[PDB]
Each structure stands twice: as C-alpha cells, then as structure tokens.
Design an enzyme around this catalytic site. Structure first.
Site, PDB file in Angstrom:
ATOM      1  N   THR A  12      -4.652   6.192   0.716  1.00  0.00           N
ATOM      2  CA  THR A  12      -5.090   7.580   0.900  1.00  0.00           C
ATOM      3  C   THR A  12      -5.771   8.127  -0.381  1.00  0.00           C
ATOM      4  OG1 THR A  12      -2.956   7.770   2.015  1.00  0.00           O
ATOM      5  CG2 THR A  12      -4.390   9.665   2.170  1.00  0.00           C
ATOM      6  N   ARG A  37       0.632  10.319   0.076  1.00  0.00           N
ATOM      7  CA  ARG A  37       0.901  11.303   1.083  1.00  0.00           C
ATOM      8  C   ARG A  37       2.232  11.979   0.841  1.00  0.00           C
ATOM      9  NH1 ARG A  37       0.623   9.573   7.013  1.00  0.00           N
ATOM     10  NH2 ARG A  37      -0.172   7.414   6.777  1.00  0.00           N
ATOM     11  N   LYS A  58     -11.689  -1.627   5.316  1.00  0.00           N
ATOM     12  CA  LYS A  58     -10.590  -1.328   6.225  1.00  0.00           C
ATOM     13  C   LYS A  58     -11.341  -0.863   7.448  1.00  0.00           C
ATOM     14  CE  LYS A  58      -6.568  -1.588   4.151  1.00  0.00           C
ATOM     15  NZ  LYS A  58      -5.646  -0.682   4.902  1.00  0.00           N
ATOM     16  N   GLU A  85       0.812  -1.220   0.000  1.00  0.00           N
ATOM     17  CA  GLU A  85       0.000   0.000   0.000  1.00  0.00           C
ATOM     18  C   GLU A  85       0.842   1.265   0.000  1.00  0.00           C
ATOM     19  OE1 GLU A  85      -2.814   0.526   3.181  1.00  0.00           O
ATOM     20  OE2 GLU A  85      -3.236   2.586   2.641  1.00  0.00           O
TER      21      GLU A  85
END
EC number: 4.1.3.42
Lengths: 213, 213, 213
Positions: free
Chosen positions: B73, B49, B133, B45
């Site tokens: 994100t 960011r 999640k 993942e």
C-alpha cells in the site's frame, strides 16, 4: 493532424474489419497479404509480437501496394520509429503513453491507440486524437462499457479489438461510435503453414459480407 | 534495474504465494513472521494500512532477518522513503504513478506496482519495469482479463492479488505470465488470538504444496 | 484544499442524488433548476455536452440562488476556467489528467473527477484529492469493483455515476465509501424539452425519499 498526410479516420473507415496479424514465418507474409486483399480486406495490422514482424511489414509494403499495411503492438517511440522506417502507413498500440503520443503526433503516420478508461481517452484527446482502439473490448466490459464510455464524447470513434468474433462483431459495428472492429480469425495460424491462402481469402470475404447492415 | 541489487523478478520467483498482511497489534508481527517462514513462506508484504505497520517491518527485519520483508500500500515517494529507511527489501503499490515510478527507480529497492489496464502497464514499462501486480484481480475480470491484457506483452510477469483464495489461486498460477499470487488467508485472526502460530505455519505449508503443478 | 472556499466534500454531502443534466434548450434551464430544488435536490451538474450549457450555468447561478450549480464533462483547463467564470460552484469531469488536476487545485472551485482504476485514483491523490466520481460505475464493474478498488483506501469517498437508477442506487448508497450517486433519470430529456416541471419535482422527491436507509 497536420503532420499526418493520411488521416487516422481514413484508415478506420476503409473497411469494417482490420485483421490483427501474428506472423511467425516471414515467407508467409506477402502471400498472406495478397490473400486478404483478394478477399476485400486491405488494412493490415502486423503486430510486433514475432521476430520477423518489422521485416514482414517492409516486404508487404514493397510487394503488395494494394494493401494499407501498418504495425500493431507499438509500445514506445523506438518501435514507432522502426515501423515508420520500414514503411508502415499507420501504427496501432494496445494502450497509450505520453512519450508515444508526443512522438506520434510529431511524426508522419497516424497512430490509433487503445484505451480502456475515460481518463486514458482524455489524455489522448489532450494530444488532439479522435480515433482510438477499444482494447481489450470484451474484458473492458464489451458493448455496454463502450456505450457508457462513449456517452459523454460524441465526436470520438473506435475500433474495438479483443474477444471479437463473427458471433458478436455486428453488435459492435451497430454502434454509432464504432467504425470497424479488429479481429484475429481471418488468418488462422495453422492456415499459414502449408500454403493455404484460398482459405484466408474466403474468411476475409465472409467477414466483409457478414458486416453489412 | 541498475539501482536495485535485489531484482523485482527474484522477489516474485521466490515462492508461489505472497502473504498480504494487515498487522493490527505490533506484538504479533515477529511471531507471525517466524511462523510463515517455518512453513516455507518468506516474502512478506506488510501493508501500510495500520498505525504500527512501519514498526512491524522494522521489527521483522531486525528479529526475523531471514524473512524477505517488504511494504504494501505504498502510495507515494514519501511512503517509499519511509519503508526503505525502516528496512523494507521491496515495495508494493496497488497502482502506479510517475513520481512513484521515478522515485522507485532512483532508489535502492524494487517496486512491483499494480496495474489494471494496458496503458498503466505501458507507463510502468516506460520506466523499464517488467514485473507487476495485477490488482484488484477478480474485479479487473480475473483470469480471462489477465489473459487478454497479457496477450500482446510476452515479456511481462504478474502477481495477481484481490479475491484470490484456495478455490482459485491454481487458475492464476497456471498462466504463463503469472509467477505468484497475493493472498490474505495464511494469517487467520483467530489463530493469532489463540497464539496458535502453528496454524499459520500449517496454512503456509498447504498454500505452497497446493500450488505445485 | 486551501484555494477552495467550498470543499468538494460539502458538495457531495449535500444530498444523496446529483442530477446529471443535459440541457438542449436554454430557456428551460432556470425553471428546471427551480423544479429540482422544489423537490429537495440542490446540487445541479450541468454537463458541457450542449451548446447552451455554459449559458445555462450562468442563468441558473444568477436566478436560482438556493441551487448549487456546477459543471459536468469538464475535460481540460480551458473548460474549467470558462465554467468558473460563468459561476459554477464545482466542476465534475468523467476522468482526470494532470493538466486538469493542476489547474483545478490552483483554482477557486472544487473539482470532483472520475476514476476507474487505483492508478487513476492515486494520481488524483497526488494532488490532495479525497473525493471522486466512480464513472462509468456499472461498466467499471459496479458495486463489487468499487468495493475492491476502495478496500485499500479508507479515507476516500465516491459519487458513482453511470448506469445508476432507482433499481440500484440503494446498493451503492449503502457503501461506506459512497456519499451520493449521480443519475440522469430525474431530468428525462423529453420532460426538459416540453416543460414538464411538476413531473421533474415529483421524480426528485421520489429520488430523495427512496434513498433513506
């Protein structure tokens, strides 16, 4: 709510405890229902968590007219239609969604949906709802969370469910915004097997008496 | 999901730990990826960011084809389209939104979105998602919260992320509803500074072994 | 926001404390506002929780020009339009909804809506918002929950409200993601009812002083 002959409010004011029922063996449904009614508990939430749930609702609607039987764990319009066809007098959902709110307000039975946040509460209010479940009560932060969440909404009423027991239900019932609580302890999964209904009646009677003042 | 050749479920059942990666210097991406794969950890993942994030995804997909590289994100349909074009094989979001769920289900790669409440979970379920999640795990109330939230939903599976570490990941992995967890400790900054990729391989190996039983 | 001459950010950066006001008697609104300004507090949130609220906002906007008065507990487009017409310079809502977000961004004044989860935050971000209330702060899990929630969003800024007092506002103000906090203690219900204005000025001055460093 113009399409609902029975108001959501009347469902919640019936008594201080609404049992959250999980029924695995269909044959136990009716006796269980009668046992709860004999103990003073009439509003029965049969959760759509077992294969025979819808058939249990239908059987209780036909053989125990003294109960106000409804459905729990209603997640979508499809299940809402199924429990309505089976005779549910009300439906409970652990949370809410626009399609479920639209289908419910257009339908004939009241829906009392769960919320965990103010935004979720506001979305239900946009469809005219005033009665909600506060689920999972403890996990959402219990009594204090509920007092905070309810602070800016004086007209809203709740039925907290989730982690509530005879040890703390009085803390919830003491709130002005709370009308009743949902609990799982009146019907011990093991009380069902073997045909032990007096036990269930006793537990229900104690729940009701333990709720006063 | 009909538009997803690789299911969301297969992404989460691959292994018990999904590294949540924050890549500050592009040059570290590929060797970091190989080191994680050498230690048995393949679902990667790469969080959106840092400025080089999309380029890291592209470089990992090109230089470490055996890794199942994805993006994290992902906040809107525009970011989803960008990571998809860059080669992401899956997308993770910290929360969900209808335009993001719609765009995802219309697209080619699975989205595993985060949820904190049952209502959010229900909105994802309206688009047919079953894998989510649970973010931020600890702040949402950790294990107990997840156990309460998941109680009425027997078919849903989770990847808790947020505050999980060696000290507590086994607690989450033991739940029936949890397939894996997301964690940040497999890639310590000082190992990268040292060029000690072997440290990363070792940590990945320990994460996997420590998750058994 | 192109339709907002005053940015939501300038509203939150004016001072460290935004008083959450509940005005029961209309006559006390103007001198209460002057008392808060005399104590260095200018951003006033008059909640729509009393019948005279919209009239208080109108009276304060017209008579206490040094004050930045806005509305609180704005639940839908209808209320937003009404406070906008009465002279509110900003609107605050305890949570958000698409209808509210859409009407606000098409309108003339900033809306700073509350959120409790990342999905609620993302929905606000879909409409271009960067400033939010974190309500109810304590019930949502306080400082730690806010730290976890904000971790993946470096550009978002908050004004926590709910359970905040002199005993803990410093813990919130110290966060890099927090611009100010909302509190009810500067305007004690019993002081507003009796006209204790020097008391209100004093509480305001202590709030501001106690917020440094």
């Amino acid at each position: 709510m113009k399409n609902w002959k029975t108001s959501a409010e009347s469902i919640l004011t019936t008594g201080p405890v609404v049992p959250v029922i999980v029924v695995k063996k269909l044959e136990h449904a009716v006796p269980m229902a009668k046992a709860l009614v004999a103990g003073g508990v009439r509003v029965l939430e049969v959760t759509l968590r077992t294969e025979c749930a819808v058939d249990a609702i239908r059987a209780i609607a036909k053989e125990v007219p003294e109960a106000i039987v409804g459905a729990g764990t209603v997640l979508n319009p499809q299940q809402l239609a199924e429990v309505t066809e089976a005779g549910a007098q009300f439906a409970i959902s652990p949370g809410l969604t626009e399609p479920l709110l639209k289908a419910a307000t257009e339908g004939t039975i009241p829906l009392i949906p769960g919320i965990s946040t103010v935004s979720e509460l506001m979305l239900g209010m946009d469809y005219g709802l005033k009665e909600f479940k506060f689920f999972p009560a403890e996990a959402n932060g219990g009594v204090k969370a509920l007092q905070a969440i309810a602070g800016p909404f004086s007209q809203v009423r709740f039925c907290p469910t989730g982690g509530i027991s005879p040890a703390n239900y009085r803390d919830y019932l003491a709130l002005k915004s709370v009308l009743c609580i949902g609990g799982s302890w009146l019907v011990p999964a093991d009380a069902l097997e073997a045909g032990d209904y007096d036990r269930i009646t006793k537990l229900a009677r104690e729940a009701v008496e333990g709720a006063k003042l």
